[PDB]
Amino acid sequence: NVIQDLYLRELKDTKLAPSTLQDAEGNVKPWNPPQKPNLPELELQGPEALKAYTEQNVETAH
Amino acid sequence: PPPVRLFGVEGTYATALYQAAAKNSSIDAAFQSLQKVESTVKKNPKLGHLLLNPALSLKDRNSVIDAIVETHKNLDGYVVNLLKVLSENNRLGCFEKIASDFGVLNDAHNGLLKGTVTSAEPLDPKSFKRIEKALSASKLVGQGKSLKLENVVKPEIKGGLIVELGDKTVDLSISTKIQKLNKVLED
A22, B9, B42, B78: most buried by Cβ count inside 10 Å? Predict the structure, then answer.
């Protein structure tokens, strides 16, 4: 009765209330990419270090 | 003890009066006299309803009783013994209350029931009659008991109806259904 009246009135006269996807974007964190793939620097590259190390520590093992 | 027990003081008076006059089997007489004295209180609207207020003594009160039986000595006499009692107990503010209460007990003894059809507006006489018939038809009025179904206007209850009698109600009203509906849409 009143159930029917409400059911009808409610459903018909506005089903959903307005919404916009564009507005949502502002209020949510946007995807942003990691910066740089990165490559590790060549650690202790070449015998520059070795020649230095042999001389630097010619320290024996006692 | 006589059917229907109205709990509460002043209805302890009514109960006593009722049971006493039921046991004296002179309830119609009592009722009639009670109506008459109630009427003569109402028809003594100033200076005998506006001096039911306490302030008067026992002795001044006794002279009020004398004035009451002076207005008509057509009183039952059991209700004159009740008048004396009320004077002695020094209350008479609830006098018409006791009368009304005796009325409930009395008309219960008669069997008469009262109902109600509260609505926002006075409904069809057809509705009134159909409901009275229906209630009499239904076990709700057991029969050997009568229904003074009274529609009352209560704009506060928006539309609808509530049928009332015997502390059993069926409430098909718009306000109540709306309440439940509002709630279900708060989910």
Answer: B78
- Angle between the N-to-C axes of helices B27-42 and B96-110, in degrees from 0 to 180, rounded to the nearest 10: 150
Report the alpha-carbon distance of residue A52 to residue A56 in Å, rounded. 6
3-state class percentages of chain B: helix first, strand second, coil last, to nearest 5: 50, 10, 40
Chain B: give the shortest CA distance to residue A10, in Å: 11
Residue B123, classed as helix, strand or coil, is coil
Substitution target in A1, A4, A5, A6 with the highest count of B β-carbons within 10 Å is A6
Nearest residue on chain B to A1, judged by CA atoms? Answer: B174
In A, minimum Cα distance to B175 occurs at A2
The answer to whether residue B179 neighbours chain A at the CB level (below 8 Å) is no
Query: For domain B11-110, which CATH number applies: 1.10.580.10, 1.10.520.20, 1.20.1250.20, 1.10.260.40?
Result: 1.10.520.20
